[PDB]
Input
Amino acid sequence: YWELAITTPRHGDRPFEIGHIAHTELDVELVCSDTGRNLGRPWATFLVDAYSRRLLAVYLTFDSPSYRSCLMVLRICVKRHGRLPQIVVVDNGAEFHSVYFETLLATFECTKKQRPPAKARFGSVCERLFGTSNTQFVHNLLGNTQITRNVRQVTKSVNPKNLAVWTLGLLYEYLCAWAYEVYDTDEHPALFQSPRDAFAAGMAIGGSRVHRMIPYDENFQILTLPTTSEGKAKVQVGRGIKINYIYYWSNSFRDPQIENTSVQIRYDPFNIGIAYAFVRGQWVQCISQYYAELQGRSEKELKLASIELRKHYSNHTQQSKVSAKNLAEFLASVEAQEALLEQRS
Amino acid sequence: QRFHQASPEDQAEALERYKTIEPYLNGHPPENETIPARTIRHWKAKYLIAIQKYGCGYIGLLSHRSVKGNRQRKLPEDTLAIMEKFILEDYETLKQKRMWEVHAALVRACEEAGVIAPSYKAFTKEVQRRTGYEQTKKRQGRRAAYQHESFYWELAITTPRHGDRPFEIGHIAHTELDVELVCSDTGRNLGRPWATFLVDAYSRRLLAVYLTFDSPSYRSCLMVLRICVKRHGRLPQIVVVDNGAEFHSVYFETLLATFECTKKQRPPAKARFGSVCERLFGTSNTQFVHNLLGNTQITRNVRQVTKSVNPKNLAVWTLGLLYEYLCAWAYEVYDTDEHPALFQS
Amino acid sequence: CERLFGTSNTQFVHNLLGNTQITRNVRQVTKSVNPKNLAVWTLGLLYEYLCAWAYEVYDTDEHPALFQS
Amino acid sequence: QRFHQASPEDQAEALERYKTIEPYLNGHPPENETIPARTIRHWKAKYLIAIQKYGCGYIGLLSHRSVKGNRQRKLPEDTLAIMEKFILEDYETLKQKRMWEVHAALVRACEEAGVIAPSYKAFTKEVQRRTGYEQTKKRQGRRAAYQHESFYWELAITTPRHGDRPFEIGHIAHTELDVELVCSDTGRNLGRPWATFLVDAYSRRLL
DNA sequence: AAAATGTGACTTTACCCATAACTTTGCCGCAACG
DNA sequence: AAAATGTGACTTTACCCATAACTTTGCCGTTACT
Ligand SMILES: [Mg+2]
Ligand SMILES: [Mg+2]
Ligand SMILES: [Mg+2]
Output
């Protein structure tokens, strides 16, 4: 499309005006920080300023993209800046539709513009950003899943499953260093400067706008939490509510009429020692079994541990096939021997 | 706090209010609005008041539907007191009276007292609101209320419950395998054998497995400890045993003293203190024991046992083969099987 | 006939001390709840009250299958 | 028979179609009709077709949703046959094996035979299709399967089950009363007394 | 005379995916009236 | 060598009547603007 007249800019006239949210699956393998077993490949969420091509915030998770994978990048952006873009643009579908994302946006007077069905030309800048990220950082990492594009050529000598040594924390540090220091200072060919310099100039022209300042307190943290697919849970006796195979407990569950009742839940994906439930018309904190084991730890590693444990639980749920196979082999010879011993008698 | 008092559907309704108001707060009202003028005016006025007082207008749009509702009791207070007394002194008793008879007695007492009698639904609803430790202990006893026990949830991090390292906390437990065993020479019914387990509570690993027909005594502990020393080389640092008389003896205590073994004693009728090995007994039952001829599963309800399905006439296994296959299970199948709370075998 | 046993359980027998009701769950029995230490009834009085129930309590009670006592 | 093939939801939908078409059948069509013209015309045409070649035209407005669906089995036939055989010969057996172990054995056999292995949910769902008397008798025994045995439902007037008059059919049965008794004099426990009941089947009166 | 051990293998709802099967409904022609 | 007995007492939903504690509306008074 060609812009004959001078309409509203597609990139913006000042920073933070349009924040494009996009997602990519890294061509890399990640192992546990305590065992070394290959978890898999992660998902990164990039929030890029359309005006300055600056990566304001990033989010790392092992899950497929959805509203929880962008509320996280929004809260990270608020953590590092304290303001939200007035036009936070997200994707269409059902994984990006919820009732807490839009409530968060309506709290701070923000506007949401979803993509049209199967048309990403509005966020076409994110496509080149993903290409640059893959061809500048991702493909330059040991054990990158570059040969996985040709499954027929994936030999055990060059298999990234037994090659990559990258971990969630170390690769997170490397990704942040590449995105916020190398990319943020490297000149972009679009506007002909570095993203940081363009952002500084745009903020100088547009001021600070202190009315959009948000205090990064605990209330905001609860304001930016996702919810499981069902949205409710059953209160078991003495145990609590199950979220991602973890039982979160609150003393409010001791009420006789709340037992085994369906209660609305919310889960923090940056720490798994704390969730929230709705009891007696009040949101109440629920403590898991990972709270004592992670009491006294800063928030800069709680999220790493939580994501790693989530992926570990998913892989354990996947291990049931091998468990059943071994049980079947053992039981087969039990039967064999049993039949032989009966025939002997 | 006002926000945190609301519910998810309150969030949705306040969001609907916000999307109704926002076009009016942008100078571009819609040409087709279902909401009338007065309602949108009220919502806009509340938005303005909230944005002019609390610094955030969305809080004005909250409904807080939990605050509305008739939380007042409808029965007279004398009836409530008399029904509470009857529940306390005629239903929570060591008689297990049915609800109908105690309700009838309550109604007769009410009719003598001249107070308004309640309905059977009222009695059932107030009995299901007093459920818990008190009811189960004043009805069936302490061993039945033990299922309705409050768990222990760690706020701070004491010494870990299952172990900081292997061979730190190890559990001893006996049981009788639900399988009828036959003799290897004369082929008569030898009854059900007894299996004793020594489990490393950290990795839940079966350190030692022993099987013998005799009732548990110091001989079983002797054999299990000798097996544990033979297979690995060292006894567990803290041996956790139950209050059985075979552990409160003179041989076991001096045996543990000789090898610098801290002996821990779980309180009587509190099996949760051995939640690792005891659950592993059920794992053995479902994975190896209950898949064998003569599995005394039907005998749980002896009313359904027939001479054709009595396991005694079906018994085929001997002691040696059952022990050797249970050892094969313990040291290879459960050994290599991945664990939930361990993320590896 | 057989269900008339169960009614005798609910209306007369399970509402007495020392009833053998909690022994269905043998795994949950303690010396403080054993009916052999709580029992106080005798054969004569138990028979007398069972006859009373069967002859003037259940006898005058309306039946669902007859719409009459 | 078409009416007998209808559901209450299908009946309500037919009622809605009739209420939509009724103004068009009286010369007073409404000026506010949300339903498009093509559907109204099709409903009217089928109304006339039914009133012509059936006898009543309402019966031409029946949906019969029950026929719709994909009942074709999605698993390969060899997979079926193997899983039938394993459910027959490794689950309903005098072992009371759990479903996970039998599914694992079936999966191992399928991988030996080079066929598709059904998921665990499929195994549980088909096992749930075999419930009743046969499975309970082939797993627990004839005593346990007796609950789901059968009810003999009277078609004609045979001799009544519970007699015709008092003192016609009386049942005799004994039981062990669930009550402990102490000795009258010495106070020692004596056990649980036995109760013998003779009761007529007509008036239920404990004889 | 006295505080601190639930647990994990197995099974079951729930959401998505593909296809069969009846009903909708805009896009076009065709007969009838002004 | 073989027909042809499930009950019913004691619970648990499920719907209706009453009232609290607010949202949801119309309607009229008031006021800025033309
Ligand atoms: Mg034991
Ligand atoms: Mg047992
Ligand atoms: Mg009895």
Remarks:
- Residues 13, 35-39, 42, 63-65, 67-72, 74, 98-100, 120-121, 124 of chain D lie near DNA strand E (CB under 10 Å from a C1').
